[model samples]
Target chain A: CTHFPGNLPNMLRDLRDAFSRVKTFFQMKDQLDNLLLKESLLEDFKGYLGCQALSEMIQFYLEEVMPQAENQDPDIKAHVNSLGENLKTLRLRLRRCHRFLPCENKSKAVEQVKNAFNKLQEKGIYKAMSEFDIFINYIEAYMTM
Target chain B: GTELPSPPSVWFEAEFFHHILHWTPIPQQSESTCYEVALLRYGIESWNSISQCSQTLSYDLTAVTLDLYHSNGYRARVRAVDGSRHSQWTVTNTRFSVDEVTLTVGSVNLEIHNGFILGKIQLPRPKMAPAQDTYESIFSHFREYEIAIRKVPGQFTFTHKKVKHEQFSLLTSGEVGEFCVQVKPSVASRSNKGMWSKEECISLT
Candidate 1:
């Protein structure tokens, strides 16, 4: 059974919120100790939300964009590939900076997130999105099963 | 009315300007790692003995510098420590020389007359079309051309038209990315049993 979650606008809004919070945390200068303490909690929230948004977007791209392109226009594949590349680049830069963050064994988890994005970029739209769907489904299953 | 104080005459010179060392970092394997690196300068009077010069410590894993002085003509060495094991000393062979203006120019025999050297400038490609007709014009033209030519990657030639009825040649060339100017006396003077005194070249690289 294949399950695609969330609409495109909702996913984009969640991703934008996650990025804004990350930017605010990075830009804060004064009261760094207090800001960092707040950031630690926010990092967990942003990380999970970012992953979920990406997963749903990839699902929608596979189910909606890929099929429509295959049936009607092949040019849309380039847009899908561009999105994957942007996500992969953002994930790599985030992983590099977050290595210095004070999180418990978060580096390995971050590496998993990076690797998932790398796989998405490398394997193209369909296969990569399928794999992402399975991974997100596994996460969802672990949360509720 | 308050009077302003006169300027003091004590001219201060830096005893030791600063030393910079650059090197690539090595990658770590397996476990979480930290590195401590130190740069040291050593003075060796003869062939075998070594004396401490100066040292700077850092915990970073990139290229760093040690800005301390040793008596002139000292060598420098650097070492890195990773956790428990200390790496072998990487010896750098650079003789620390003092910057003294008087001693530097004293060894040269060339004289500067009225801020200009009397010489005939030789165009490199003398037989070329641009050189044959305008040799004299080109020589004079260099006064303006030099401003732009000097800004170029490699072109340094200057000219002046008078000196005891003798002409001199000034040629500037780049060596190892360093621009050096050489003053050449006229070839006619060689026949008079008078040798062209070469000026100690100035580097503008």
Candidate 2:
């Protein structure tokens, strides 16, 4: 069995709660209803080792999505703070795991999400935020095993 | 200075996750008075108007507030519009949170087959939400059902089991007595002090 963080369950739970709030609000702001994480991307994540892609996705959200999200409704801003803290912890844990255990599979899922965001252009930020729930679900499905 | 009509009385009515902003028409000399409603993220910038809500007495806020963090408050304001004259905005004095709303009771179904208990959970759908965004679709990813089981005419205590699958099973192959099962639904990040469904008891041969 793969070694996961002892607090992995707690982290996922909090992430789900925090992201759901932002996801709900940004979805309304997503005027184009564009989806960044496609179903096929998640299907790819499930079939292979998702550590690299999951780690990359977490970094992208922390660096890109979180910054763009700051200029949002005050309530949503409050929720984003909670999400950021948890993601930072998750990133650190994953980095520690990478030093010892090499991943078996190379993942392109996170790249797909990044490219899709670039394609959407104007509505990319909001669309990316809205579609994050799919990634959250993908993380749970792949990591909880 | 032009005189303004009286502001409408605005308030919110909520059930579980569904919320509605309602206003009574202000006393008006003109027969047709349109109403404009806007929402303010409590402690946020200026109000955001729902254009479609204009001329409507009530507006469903569920879609907008569905995923809002429950503790972050929100308010709705409404004003009367008669001809060129408009009324002062009447904001709901009290802010509302989705967490404050009551949860509808949730349920599950259980069947005993080949000494195994097969189960499925049923969650609530917001009356105002579309079929695509029901509670199941929104919460199913992070939520789970807690199943409680106890031996019939045996121990008074129960064994609790948590499962995330929509359809799941528990093996009771070695058990020889009847058992009663009950289910409660909860979000993983939140408390599990949720209401439980009626118990279903089954006997083994």
Candidate 3:
């Protein structure tokens, strides 16, 4: 039902491509073996909460997760910078799409993601970033027609 | 120290998504110079060694990098050790991104059907490993294909279109003349496009 134009699919695929770049590095470093977005939690993202959940999740990455990476190596810092810009662009458009429809209130799914990340404490950033693919998959499932 | 063996000079090379770590080593003397290579992800700070690449001169990074996003950057370092002493690491001058690879097409296969030209694009499937022929398509990383067509032996005009399918047709069944087509692959964003294939032409009766 969210037809935000034909560009959404390509943008989502590009987002996934960006995440695929660091997927292994971050996941390997996540020694805690924690799950950020549980399977049942993501099932809720498939419903009306999808739009707000996606938006909030992007906000969490842009604001919360990325700031923890200030001391990263230059090469990785560059990738993170580009990935932030990519998310910013998607966030801008997602706001429009979310606003266009009668979206529900901020979903508990976002809170669950943040709570999971917080539980990991110092390693929360890596753990949260590693599971981005799951978020992308469910969002793509719900958003793209 | 001054007595340590010279570090290996290394560089990166890739085709499509297949990345290789290549290095030139100093001549072995009393003891063979064993080279150890390490990789750094732009996301993390430490240099991690590839177990498979230990004591090797060149390594395929396709599988290691397969999980990476197309635009991510990484670097490699190589050091030479002769029994006891080891040289300082020689790091690549810059980071390597899979997107930095220049995508190439080998040929454009063409057939004439009902006065129309049917075409299929070809690309080299780079092997993921040094041994077996297990391979992957360059187009796997790209979002779309582009084709350029023109009425050859007539005018300089050409028509270009972005296509989703590799198999495409040019010229209607009624239009009969000599025509040529060239094809290339492209990403949706900042990365470079694949090199265009050589123009392939056909004549329709």
Candidate 4:
């Protein structure tokens, strides 16, 4: 895949934002523990926060940037697409853990996040973005049919 | 059913046969007790009392070998049994001689020559990078340099007498990256046959 210098800035920015959300989610959980909030409420809030953060990250990349960059720079699009697929897999893992709630779903989600981060490193921004574009396009087509 | 006639043992003689038996070095055991062992060529059909060699150590013949060949990258399964208790198999990768390729750097082209086999290469320590640049930037620059050098065929001309070794720190978030250089002496050199010269390492890095 062809590399573009322009994609670096936005890619890095989005990565920072994603990491920030992740950090915030953990920070809130820490606060809850320190404050000694109701156990059930704290648990529910943690799950919701986790799901929200992942959804936001995936949506921002998949729904927003993926479409615009798909035609001009396919490599970045591929990278995004792979990331989206990884996120989808992560969502499935989250759902499974949720059914067995308060059963280490938080740890599982953290592991998934780590796995996604590793995949991002392995695939890199360029390839994942391009793969993400193709994934988005396929979903759109399927919806239309 | 009637008993079938036994097949003849085909004894084919060879000078030497290679067999790889993997067991951890018995730390306390003396070297004299360590014997070279082989796998059986024919497997044992029955270990029951009805067998003719019931009293003897009747090992499966099919598993034994009398020939020498490459181990073909097999894992070793080790077990220890005492009385009624048998220890779990401790598996480990089979160790084999690694074939190494030496890259010789001279006034002429960088040549890759055959040498005594060693899998890993030891790289020289690098020098500090230029000020005000992140390790990522320096690494990208080095990668660019490698790509450019690869395009030029034959001998390469360097502006400096000795190659500059650039050192960068590995950071979890920051841009600094590590760099290494390996040098090999020419095949014609007799004393330092496989060894690399310090100057050559400097130039190559």
Model 1, range B23-114, lDDT digits (tens) per residue?
A: 33333321332223233323322333222221222222111212221123233334444345544554433332222100100122222344
**Interface root-mean-square deviation, each candidate:** 31.1, 10.9, 9.5, 25.1
Q: Which parts of model 2 have CA positions greater than 4 angstroms off?
A: A1-9, A12-88, A97-145, B1-16, B20-73, B76-106, B151-156, B171-179, B189-194, B198-205
Tens-digit lDDT string for candidate 4 (B35-136)? 222222112222221112111112222123311122222222333332333334333222111111122222222322232111122232212212333223
Candidates, DockQ: 0.00, 0.06, 0.06, 0.01
For residues A20-125, what per-residue lDDT tens digits would candidate 2 score against the true structure? 6666476435433233565565665565556556656667888888877765556667788787987786566555554422462335776887898899898999
Report how far off residue B193 is in candidate 2 (Å).
Answer: 6.6
C-alpha lDDT of candidate 2 relative to the true structure: 0.66
Model 3 per-residue lDDT at B66: 63
Please tell me what DockQ candidate 4 reaches. Answer: 0.01
Off by over 4 Å in 1: A1-145, B1-16, B27-70, B94-205
lDDT of 3 at B104: 64
Cα deviation of B79, candidate 3, in Å: 1.9
Residue pairs with clashing backbones, model 2: none
- For every candidate, give the share of true A-B contacts it also has: 0.00, 0.08, 0.03, 0.00
TM-scores vs. true structure, each candidate: 0.18, 0.41, 0.51, 0.17
Pull out the clashing pairs in model 3. A20-B68, A20-B69, A21-B68, A21-B69, A76-B42
lDDT, residue B74, candidate 2: 74
- lDDT by residue (B1-205, candidate 2, tens digit) is 4866655477777655667888777665456678777776654555788742366678888777765543256767788777777778887745556444434334566777875778776666556556666665545445667778888679788988888665678788677778787777666654224667788777764
Misplaced by over 4 Å in model 3 are: A9-53, A64-86, A98-145, B1-11, B23-35, B38-58, B62-76, B81-84, B91-107, B113-115, B122-142, B149-159, B172-180, B189-193, B198-205
